[PDB]
């Protein structure tokens, strides 16, 4: 049933991101945390190159407008001071 | 013959309609695009197959970030019959570097800086 | 609005009808206080629980055995805490995660009991007429756990 | 009843059908191609505003492809490799 | 016969099942040649004949006498 | 006859003790008994798809039995377990629904409360 | 295969985890060469690493033979009777450790097919289903179309 | 539950006999119950290897 699943926005999969996935599956009696797990890791490998990647399009982005936006103002101060006898 | 298809312009023109349908403003539009590949190439021509490799699409069902510009657009127009395109939704603000490792791109096509 | 009473007038299955609200929550506080009063008082035996370890939902009990498909990074004999427990049961009651119970509630514990490679497993590919021929052995490392103890609190 | 030659492929062939089921998942797919269209129809930049933002990247991409396909050479032969092959005769005195 | 409660916070359930006993009432008092051969034996226990007829010794040494025991 | 295979014995052993068990010829004759067994490799290969795909019908089908014991149909049963965010699969409904009655009959009810 | 495979279930040899944990190898046994490009690596592997084995299992005896038949091996003998015959023919110190790690950690039961990936003694809390659970009684016990 | 082996494993093979009355009933649906209850189909226990068919009696 995973259209419910996404219309409440969660994964459309259990076996995505969620508590059942992210969580550690175990721990020392003790208490002391388990190493985390390589399935673990590897998604939060993947994750961190998303943000990554989300977070240089975007500068790349923004960089171009205001580039092209100091063009357009050196284009237009240029040639008003072409006026100049 | 068979041959690539000139998608007429009038295909991407969004109506009021659209709008309140999907939920995009056309004024300040989405930056970014979240396309995930749904359909196989198979079957599909060389150059459909080319476009998916290069925007980087070879698994499905793996979300891939691209930049909401017009040449991309043109790729993605060309391809898209096979993807899923979600604007990417930024409710705090791009990761800073402190959490960078801390972010989660959930089903709704939300980055959330928490997780 | 009224429809004469006819074999389409009204849907076949039963309606059924929401309780009203105050009613439902005073007798959701009656049944937990009750199945509380039950796990203070000890008032269960065997307790059961399915847990999601590895990558599957295991039904467990106390001096179980479990045979996970991998090597698990801990010593024989080492005991462990199995975290993702999404249902625990009794003879008269049972609690079900949401999708999983609280830490608070039940604590699953296990002992790394053996650490083994799979019997060899034959992977074959064959095509007719191609001179396709291809065989691989496989071993899967392997981990025994032994279910020690299921104990449940009075955290409801 | 039978179809004359090879089904699917002649002139005459097995007629097929198109189920309620067939006719969904088509629609499901039409959808969310419609929803690819709204999405494709709002353009962040314009093309004046994109050329060019890319290039310093691009072309820095490209340096490493030519770094990496210019620094193929062979490694590098080490006298501990080969004096190490003495050691199959090892023994215990 | 259950009785099903979420918790206060909402994040889990609780199902209260007893075991019902039988009433008394619902209680009674306690009383107090080969091809004939398979065919009523086949009769008595409502399976074909072909279950009853022997097998080679082929089959019969195949047949695995110490299987592995469960529990 | 500069060099001459000695092995052979053993080769032919390594096909052979696979097929031990065939019926006929293909037991005892190389040229049969290694045919077989090539076939016999890659139906152990390929049946592991379809033991996991019988082990979901079979658990699909014993969930169904279970549920129609309770008057539920099993995607009603699934589902409303779904929408109740109860995640046990269908292998541990089953081991539920054999050895835990009174559970399976918790849940049961639960779907159909929450159908209702 | 399995059909032309012996094959077993889960279990342990006393119930190893209930009380206490057991290392059910109790003897390993090196037999090695002085001389012989076989047995470099189980040289090295009894000068460098058999010692801290040794003490980090002080329940398995180990003896170390420096005069082998036909190969190299390591013998391992567990508890259950079961004794494990490895060839450390040609294999590096590395390969030998993580052999002998693998001897110390694994049990004397057979490397088989196991039918089950668990095993329950006590599979059932609330009763193993039974086709007269869950269908109700009737008055007097009346079987239906039963006249009184 | 705490039956013993023998015992316990008769009551979850036991065959049980089914009553269904056709009269005005579309053979069809009498043969779809009486077909899930002679394949033993209804028993969450139901494999099939197991023989774990019912009796059916259609009047
Ligand atoms: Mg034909």
């Not at chain 2, 476009?51 to 891939?64: C, D, F, N, R, V």
């Amino acid at each position: 049933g995973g259209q419910w699943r996404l219309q409440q926005g969660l994964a459309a999969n259990p076996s995505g991101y969620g508590p059942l996935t992210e969580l550690p599956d175990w721990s020392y009696a003790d208490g002391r945390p388990a190493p985390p797990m390589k399935g673990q890791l590897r998604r939060k490998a993947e994750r961190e190159t998303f943000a990554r990647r989300v977070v240089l399009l975007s500068q790349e982005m923004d960089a171009g407008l205001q580039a092209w936006q100091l063009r357009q103002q050196k284009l237009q101060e240029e040639q008003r001071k072409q006026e100049n006898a | 013959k068979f041959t690539r298809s000139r998608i007429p312009e009038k295909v991407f023109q969004a109506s009021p309609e659209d709008h309140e349908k999907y939920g995009g403003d056309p004024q300040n539009p989405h930056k970014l695009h979240i396309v995930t590949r749904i359909k196989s190439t198979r079957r599909r021509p060389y150059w459909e197959k080319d476009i998916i490799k290069m925007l980087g699409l070879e698994k499905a069902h793996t979300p891939q970030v691209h930049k909401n510009i017009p040449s991309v657009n043109a790729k993605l127009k060309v391809v898209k019959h096979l993807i899923r395109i979600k604007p990417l939704k930024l409710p705090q603000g791009l990761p800073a570097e402190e959490n960078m490792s801390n972010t989660c791109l959930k089903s709704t096509g939300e980055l959330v800086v928490q997780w | 609005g009224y429809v004469p009473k006819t074999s389409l007038s009204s849907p076949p299955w039963p309606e059924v009808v929401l309780p009203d609200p105050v009613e439902e929550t005073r007798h959701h506080a009656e049944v937990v206080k009750k199945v509380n009063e039950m796990i203070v008082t000890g008032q269960y035996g065997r307790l059961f629980a399915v847990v999601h370890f590895a990558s599957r939902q295991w039904k467990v009990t106390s001096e179980d055995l479990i045979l996970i498909g991998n090597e698990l990074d801990l010593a024989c004999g080492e005991r462990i805490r199995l975290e993702k427990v999404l249902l625990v049961g009794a003879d008269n009651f049972t609690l079900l995660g949401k999708p999983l119970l609280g830490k608070d509630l039940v604590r699953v514990e296990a002992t790394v009991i053996e650490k083994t490679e799979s019997w060899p497993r034959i992977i074959m590919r064959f095509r007719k007429r191609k001179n396709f021929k291809k065989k691989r052995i496989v071993t899967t490392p392997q981990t025994v756990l032994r279910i020690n103890s299921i104990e449940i609190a009075p955290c409801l | 009843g039978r179809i004359p030659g090879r089904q699917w492929i002649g002139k005459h062939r097995r007629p097929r059908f198109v189920s309620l089921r067939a006719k969904q998942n088509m629609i499901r797919r039409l959808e969310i191609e419609a929803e690819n269209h709204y999405w494709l129809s709002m353009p962040y930049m314009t093309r004046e505003q994109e050329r060019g933002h890319a290039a310093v990247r691009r072309r820095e991409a490209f340096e490493a492809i030519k770094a990496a396909a210019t620094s193929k050479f062979p490694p590098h032969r080490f006298i501990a490799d080969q004096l190490d092959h003495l050691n199959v005769t090892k023994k215990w005195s | 016969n259950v009785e099903l409660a979420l918790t206060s916070d909402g994040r889990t359930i609780v199902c209260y099942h007893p075991s019902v006993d039988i009433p008394y009432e619902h209680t009674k008092p306690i009383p107090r040649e080969e091809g004939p051969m398979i065919e009523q034996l086949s009769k008595m226990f409502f399976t074909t004949k072909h279950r009853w007829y022997p097998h080679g010794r082929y089959h019969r040494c195949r047949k695995n006498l110490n299987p592995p025991k469960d529990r | 006859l500069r060099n001459r295979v000695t092995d052979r014995y053993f080769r032919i052993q390594e096909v052979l003790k696979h097929a031990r068990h065939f019926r006929g010829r293909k037991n005892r004759c190389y040229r049969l008994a290694v045919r077989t067994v090539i076939r016999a490799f890659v139906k152990c290969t390929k049946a592991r798809y379809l033991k996991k795909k019988n082990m979901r019908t079979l658990w699909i089908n014993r969930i169904t039995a279970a549920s129609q014991e309770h008057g539920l149909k099993y995607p009603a049963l699934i589902g409303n377990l779904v929408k109740c965010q109860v995640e046990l699969n269908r292998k541990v409904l089953a081991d539920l629904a054999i050895y835990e009655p009174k559970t399976f009959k918790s849940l049961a009810a639960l779907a159909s409360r929450r159908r209702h | 295969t399995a059909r032309g495979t012996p094959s077993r279930f889960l279990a342990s040899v006393l119930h190893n985890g209930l009380g206490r944990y057991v290392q059910q190898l109790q003897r390993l046994s090196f037999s090695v060469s002085r001389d012989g490009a076989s047995s470099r690596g189980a040289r090295e592997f009894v000068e460098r690493e058999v010692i801290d084995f040794a003490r980090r299992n002080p329940g398995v005896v180990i003896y170390v033979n420096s005069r082998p038949c036909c190969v190299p091996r390591v013998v391992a003998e567990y508890l259950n009777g079961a004794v494990r015959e490895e060839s450390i023919h040609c294999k590096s110190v590395e390969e030998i450790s993580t052999l002998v790690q693998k001897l110390a950690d694994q049990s004397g039961l057979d490397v088989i097919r196991i039918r089950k990936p668990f095993h329950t003694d006590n599979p059932s809390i609330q009763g193993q289903w039974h086709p007269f659970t869950n269908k109700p009684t009737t008055f007097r016990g009346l079987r239906p179309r039963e006249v009184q | 539950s705490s039956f013993s082996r023998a015992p316990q494993q008769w009551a979850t093979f036991a065959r049980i006999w089914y009553l269904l009355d056709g009269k005005m009933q579309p053979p069809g649906k009498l043969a779809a119950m009486a077909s899930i209850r002679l394949q033993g189909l209804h028993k969450p226990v139901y494999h099939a290897l197991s023989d774990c068919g019912d009796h059916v009696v259609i009047m």
